[PDB]
Structure 1
């Protein structure tokens, strides 16, 4: 099962790289879209009140 250990270490490296580099930008994109839709909802409510 030595190859199993090697491929597990490879997957650990891949996951570390993902969490370090890729996850933050995609999280930022999701947050930006969520904030945009929330702001659109708030602005629509404000416009109706106005």
Structure 2
């Protein structure tokens, strides 16, 4: 039974490409949102202390 071999191999190559294209950019976008909201709350603290 080598169908398992083909399927697992396909899963390996597609997760490789996932780590090549998708997850870098989506992590970038979520980290950018995190950065923006953290900057907003930091400026909130700054406004409070001012």
C-alpha RMSD over aligned residues:
0.6
Q: Which ranges of 4 or more aligned residues in structure 1 deviate by more than 6 Å?
A: none
Give the structure-2-normalised TM-score. 0.94
Deviation at 1:17, TM superposition (A): 0.6
Give the structure-1-normalised TM-score. 0.94
Q: Which runs of 5+ in 1 are unaligned?
A: none
Aligned twin of 1:41: 41
Deviation at 1:13, TM superposition (A): 0.7
C-alpha offsets along residues 3-44 of structure 1, whole Å, 9 cap, x if unaligned?
000000000011001000111100100110111111011000
Give the paired residue count: 50
Q: Which runs of 5+ in 2 are unaligned?
A: none
